[PDB]
Design a protein around this ligand. Structure first.
Ligand SMILES: [Cl-]
Ligand SMILES: [Cl-]
Ligand SMILES: [Cl-]
Ligand SMILES: [Cl-]
Ligand SMILES: [Cl-]
Length: 129
């Protein structure tokens, strides 16, 4: 499923990401844009052989099991495929574990390089929320 920008924002808010750990809703929408283009079926390979899955490109190195990432953990205790559903529950709950881990949203390299320090509020401009 490919989300509309305001559609994604609404689901993220309902799922409680709005100022979760102090990160305003715009941050999460910005991250999702550049990680996955709001496409829940997005998958990308990393240099270490792990894979990123879902609207928020959660990686198999630490957070989900895909059975093909040697020397990896599954800290959110989910199959990585579960993250590609049109329902973003599993991704959001996992992201909540991740962002509470210590580096906050810097865990998402795209957020760090492309959203951090920008006006992320622009990403929920005009949305009914
Ligand atoms: Cl957009
Ligand atoms: Cl709807
Ligand atoms: Cl584990
Ligand atoms: Cl990570
Ligand atoms: Cl980047």
């Amino acid at each position: 499923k490919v989300f509309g920008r305001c559609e994604l924002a609404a689901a993220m808010k309902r799922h409680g990401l709005d100022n979760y750990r102090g990160y305003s809703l715009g941050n999460w929408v910005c991250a999702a844009k550049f990680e996955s283009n709001f496409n829940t079926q997005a998958t990308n390979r990393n240099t270490d052989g792990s894979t990123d899955y879902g609207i928020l490109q959660i990686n198999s190195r630490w957070w989900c099991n895909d059975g093909r990432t040697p020397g990896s953990r599954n800290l959110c205790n989910i199959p990585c495929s579960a993250l590609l559903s049109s329902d973003i529950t599993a991704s959001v709950n996992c992201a909540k574990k991740i962002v509470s881990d210590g580096n906050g949203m810097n865990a998402w390299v795209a957020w760090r390089n492309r959203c951090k320090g920008t006006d992320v509020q622009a990403w929920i401009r005009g949305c009914r929320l």
